[PDB]
Design a protein around this nucleic acid. Structure first.
Ligand SMILES: Nc1ncnc2c1ncn2[C@@H]1O[C@H](COP(=O)(O)OP(=O)(O)NP(=O)(O)O)[C@@H](O)[C@H]1O
Ligand SMILES: Nc1ncnc2c1ncn2[C@@H]1O[C@H](COP(=O)(O)OP(=O)(O)NP(=O)(O)O)[C@@H](O)[C@H]1O
Ligand SMILES: [Mg+2]
Ligand SMILES: [Mg+2]
Lengths: 340, 44, 90, 13, 341
DNA sequence: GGATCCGCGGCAGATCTGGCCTG
DNA sequence: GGCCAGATCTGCCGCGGATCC
């Protein structure tokens, strides 16, 4: 899988015509407010990623935006186009209009941004949401199960809050959905962890791991039964998959209370790389990797280790203030991209 | 008001009085010279 | 012929003990807060309305909490609707 | 010493 | 204002005896996981500040008590501060006797710069409003009292509205008694605060900066309340008041949470902190101590040069990072020990 | 082109940590 | 010792954007 060519028109402050990355590792160098982030975001969007408001991606004082990418995978090349404006996105695959759910099947790309630290140093809700979306990216049953469980819990809470009534079927539905959600989460986390541990061991010297806390580990029905008095007193369901907690551990201690900036950044990068490797082993071919602002808050040894690890990937693009040594480099000045 | 600086510095070092407390004490001692002369002559 | 209104007997005794003035004394059921459900009906406003005869001045000795201020405002509005000059402590 | 400094400063005021 | 000596015992991973910063610009250099942040946090907590970290997580692994000690001298005279961190709670000993924490609020103190400001600038509406409230609350206590009273009155009126009917105009007047005062105080503070921020930011970059505060109730709380009775009846909640204002930061006349990069946002956060430092120094007469963490990480050469130029004219400041600025005294941190060549 | 649905920013209400006054 | 101030956490409602017939 290689991104052969990429064109755009009226997208943020970009003012280029074409960009042709070479195979293997590459680099981008620019000063503040030049357009590295805009270029990476456009490349991510062109392949069918996720992002900024849809109306904020158009150049100032304009109404139409155009993105075009040409990728030649192993089986055969194909083209993509995007139209943005007031009406909305118009994704067409090789000339035929099609929905995004079709693009969901394609490999795509992985983007690493400074926004991934909040999944490590954030509150419980952010970590739970991150885990939910990470699991959802691999399977389709998970989203339907989550939606059904949410609706059932909403109905049960609404019925319980307003006086009293017969609560027999709602408990059955809630248990029937939770027993599957918890099992799927356990099955995924049993396999995810070793890859992350190995990747972090490659990147750094300490040890990393994951811990999941389950309120109802034996059954939703029994957990609901064993708390009826306080459930009726408070008026809310106090057990279920929607109250689990996920904690990242550095040397057996929570990361959101003891880790520093460099350790947190390394942990986030390791998580993203583990996800990339799992996606590559699952779909069939590794996706393109995009890393933004790779080496600011790291020392010399960590930067060298990161570069050595990234040297072995089929394709990657790095952006930052300082050029890595020994790799091809391209510069960005006021939105235009020029290469030697 | 430059004269009161030495008095404030002297009163600041003793324990139990904060930097703002010393200024308040000096100000209270400025217009109460009756006891102020006695205060200096209390121990000497 | 002076009347005062007080939340409870505790402030009644506290005010009388100092003894600045002597006059007719009145006590309410309590404050006026809707969080735990005490409206005008749950208070003794009805009893207060029986003996406005011969009254030329009323002072609202009420606490400094927000519920006290709301009660004082309600009482002032009601008495002004009936019509009596009112005062409050500083 | 320290007390004497206070004593001499008090004469100024 | 000037700091003279700092000593500690069993604080985070620190292990040292004493540290004597020189008067003027200073620096610190260290690799990852060495203790620069720990040292700055310890200094900030010793001088009477507030540390976001929990109290129970500021001691070593195994020990159960921590000790801090600082020696600072001001224009008035020297004095010593001491903190005893432990399981029971914080206690302060000014010159040797127990002192309430509110007393240190009158002292100069210090200001700390951290990426939390950068997070707050690019945050949601509620975070910006909370930042404005906390910033204003450091110049008066009347503001805090008014905020507490307004919150209690709003809760009372909302509880009344949620179910049933009763006398309602009384609570309306009660809430309007405080809303106008809060609005007037905010307007006056913003009017006094904006030009300093503009002139401070004009020396760090080239673009324009400003502030904007839109109000739901400008003419008065009562008039706006009487003009939205139907919406309140339908929804069941109050929809007008100071508790729904919006604060926006502008770069070249555009919102900064949608059209800004990392460098510009970091520069804005630093400018806000420097303006607060200048205003506080003017207020108390003696400017406080400035502590900067990760001074020049995500900045280019020109911005770093501009930052170094500004901090050279301050009485005393301490910078930390992974690189040594050219031409300034440098100290090194290795596994918790600070040695000055 | 109309209409049901899905996901996320924004806000009010309940819990909980650490400092304070009265005695 | 006992009451309050102020930050963190959880669930409900209205709004924007993708999909269908
Ligand atoms: N919609 C837009 N229309 C026009 N110009 C825009 C728009 N959005 C952003 N810009 C400009 O692009 C800049 C941001 O460019 P960006 O791609 O974030 O730079 P960057 O190289 O990643 N900088 P940095 O990350 O700080 O080192 C803004 O400061 C504006 O000058
Ligand atoms: N309570 C504690 N007891 C012992 N060690 C601790 C404690 N809290 C943190 N640490 C360790 O102290 C180190 C973090 O120190 P810190 O002061 O954050 O470093 P730093 O120099 O700012 N590094 P960085 O900002 O990442 O470049 C890590 O090795 C932590 O494991
Ligand atoms: Mg950027
Ligand atoms: Mg640090």
């Amino acid at each position: 899988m290689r991104l052969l060519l990429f064109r755009q028109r009226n997208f943020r402050n970009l003012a280029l015509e074409a960009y042709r990355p070479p195979p293997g590792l590459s680099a981008l160098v620019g000063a503040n407010a030049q357009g590295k982030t805009s270029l990476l975001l456009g490349i991510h969007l062109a392949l069918g990623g996720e992002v900024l408001g849809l109306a904020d991606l158009v150049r100032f004082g304009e109404e139409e935006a155009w993105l075009h990418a040409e990728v030649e995978t192993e089986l055969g090349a194909y083209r993509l186009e995007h139209r943005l404006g007031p009406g909305g996105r118009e994704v067409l695959l090789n000339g035929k209009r099609v929905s995004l759910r079709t693009l969901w099947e394609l490999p795509g790309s992985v983007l690493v941004s400074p926004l991934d630290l909040e999944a490590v140093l954030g509150p419980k809700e952010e970590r739970r949401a991150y885990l939910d979306r990470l699991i959802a990216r691999f399977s389709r049953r998970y989203a339907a199960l989550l939606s059904a469980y949410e609706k059932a819990l909403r109905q049960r809470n609404a019925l319980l809050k307003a006086g009293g009534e017969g609560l027999s079927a709602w408990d059955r539905e809630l248990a029937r959905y939770g027993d599957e959600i918890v099992a799927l989460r356990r099955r995924f986390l049993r396999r995810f962890a070793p890859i992350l541990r190995e990747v972090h061991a490659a990147l750094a010297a300490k040890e990393a791991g994951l811990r999941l806390e389950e309120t109802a580990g034996e059954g939703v029905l029994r957990a609901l039964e064993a708390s009826r008095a306080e459930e009726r007193e408070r008026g809310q369901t106090l057990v279920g998959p929607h109250r689990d907690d996920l904690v990242f551990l550095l040397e057996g201690r929570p990361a959101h209370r003891f880790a520093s900036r460099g350790e947190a950044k390394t942990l986030a990068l390791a998580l993203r790389l583990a996800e990339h490797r799992l996606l590559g082993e699952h779909h069939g071919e590794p996706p393109l990797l995009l890393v933004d602002e790779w080496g600011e808050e790291l020392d010399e040894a960590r930067r060298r280790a990161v570069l050595a690890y990234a040297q072995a990937l089929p394709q990657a693009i790095l952006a930052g203030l300082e050029a890595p040594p020994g790799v091809p480099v391209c510069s960005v000045v006021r939105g235009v991209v020029l290469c030697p | 008001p430059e004269s009161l600086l030495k008095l404030t510095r002297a009163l600041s070092r003793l324990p139990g009085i904060g930097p703002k407390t010393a200024q308040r004490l000096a100000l209270h001692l400025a217009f109460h010279k009756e006891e102020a002369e006695a205060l200096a002559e209390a121990l000497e | 012929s002076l009347l005062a209104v007080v939340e409870s007997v505790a402030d009644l005794y506290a005010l009388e003990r100092s003894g600045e003035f002597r006059g007719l004394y009145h006590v309410l059921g309590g404050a006026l807060n809707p969080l735990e459900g005490i409206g005008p009906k749950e208070l003794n406003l009805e009893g207060l309305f029986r003996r406005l005869e011969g009254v030329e001045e009323v002072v609202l000795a009420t606490s400094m909490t927000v519920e006290g201020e709301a009660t004082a405002l309600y009482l002032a509005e009601e008495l002004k609707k009936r019509g009596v000059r009112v005062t409050r402590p500083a | 010493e320290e007390a004497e400094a206070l004593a001499e400063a008090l004469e100024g005021i």
